Amino acid sequence: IGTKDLGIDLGTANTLVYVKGKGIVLREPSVVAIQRDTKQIVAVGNEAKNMIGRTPGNIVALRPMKADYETTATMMKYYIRKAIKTKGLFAGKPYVMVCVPYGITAVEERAVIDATRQAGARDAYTIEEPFAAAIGANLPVWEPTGSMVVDIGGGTTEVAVISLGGIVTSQSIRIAGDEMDEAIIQYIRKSYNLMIGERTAEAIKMEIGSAGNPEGIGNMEIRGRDLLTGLPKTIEISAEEVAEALRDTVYAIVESVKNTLEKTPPELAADIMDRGIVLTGGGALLRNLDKVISQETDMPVIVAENPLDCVAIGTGKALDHIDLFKNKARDHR
């Protein structure tokens, strides 16, 4: 009982490790450096970032979280080892709670667990990302009343209705932050014959992006490739245009919220109408998305406190409930 148990959120962009009794102790990019020819991972996280910055050549920089067995095991080994400052004398390895995407299958869950134990966990358990998000957002997930979370990440939006320590109904769509970026890229290509890159698209979304009602958000000067001449060009784009670019993405997200509500038992949907829907993840920060989802569902919608950290916090808080997740894993044997 001397080694502190761990919760790990291996996110698409950032990895966060929660240590029982200590909180978030590790905040590192979900990045790996591999040897360009032998495809071997030579650094992880901040160490990969530092090595990339020293440009030693013969290295390739990768974001492997969108994982295969050996990459998970290698990344887990690094993060577990780095987060644990001291070991127990009689049991030097932690129990580890691993955040996994919604809809993970049984065989996949056993593979994640195996990779985590290979990485040095005494034993390992999994928790679905929207359930971790609801726990970390402080929703009353253990009570017999309905709670709703909408976790908008990079590659997926997950919607879940929670009650009594479990997901009652849920939906996941592959429409999130990455797809907002792509919609912006495609709108600018079609409207201005201009090809922008990923950095500029993300910057546009962050600086003047919104889900609707973009009054006073402002305009931005952007640079990219004139598709006629192939030379770089600068134009000014408006928050109004960006809002129109993001419309189909936003309403796909709204549709997934509605579709989940439609599959939801009436009394749980009634509870949510009363307490409100909570948005988590980086995509929850899209200006006015809460207002748009609220307007389209006639339900209260709030952005969670600490929306970027909710999943990792909930993965750590799940350590006070290991019996539940123990039982969940034995279901998926």
Residue numbers in the entry: 4 to 69, 74 to 340
Quoted passage from the original study:
In vivo, MreB proteins form discrete, nanometer-long, membrane-associated polymeric assemblies along the cell cylinder that move processively around the rod circumference together with proteins of the cell wall (CW) elongation machinery, forming the so-called Rod complex. The current model is that self-aligned MreB filaments restrict the diffusion of CW biosynthetic proteins in the membrane and orient their motion to insert new peptidoglycan strands in radial hoops perpendicular to the long axis of the cell, promoting the cylindrical expansion of rod-shaped cells. We successfully purified a soluble form of MreB from the Gram-positive thermophilic Geobacillus stearothermophilus (MreBGs) and elucidated its crystal structure, confirming the classical actin/MreB fold and the presence of the small hydrophobic loop shown to mediate membrane binding in MreBTm and MreB5Sc. We also show that the interaction with lipids is mediated by electrostatic interactions and by two spatially close hydrophobic motifs in the MreBGs monomers that comprise the small hydrophobic loop and the N-terminal end.
The crystals belong to the monoclinic P21 space group and contain one molecule of MreBGs per asymmetric unit. Monomers of apo MreBGs display the canonical fold of actin-like proteins, characterized by four subdomains IA, IIA, IB and IIB. Subdomain IA (blue) of MreBGs is formed by residues 1–32, 66–145 and 315–347; subdomain IB (yellow) by residues 33–65; IIA (red) by residues 146–181 and 246–314 and IIB (green) by residues 182–245. Loop β6-α2, which connects subdomains IA and IB and closes the nucleotide-binding pocket, is partially disordered in apo MreBGs. In domain IA, the hydrophobic loop α2-β7, which has been shown to be involved in MreBTm membrane binding and is 2 residues longer in MreBGs, displays a distinct conformation, packed on the N-terminal extremity of the polypeptide chain. Crystal packing analysis revealed straight protofilaments characterized by a subunit repeat distance of 51 Å, similar to that observed in crystal structures of other actin homologs. However, because of the open conformation of MreBGs, domain IB interacts with domain IA and not with domain IIA as observed for example for MreBTm. We noticed that in the crystal structure of the apo form of MreBGs this short hydrophobic N-terminal sequence is in close proximity to loop α2-β7, which in MreBTm carries the hydrophobic residues L93 and F94 involved in membrane binding. Interestingly, analysis of the crystal structure of MreBGs also showed that a cluster of positively charged residues surrounds the protruding hydrophobic subdomain formed by the α2-β7 loop and the N-terminal sequence.
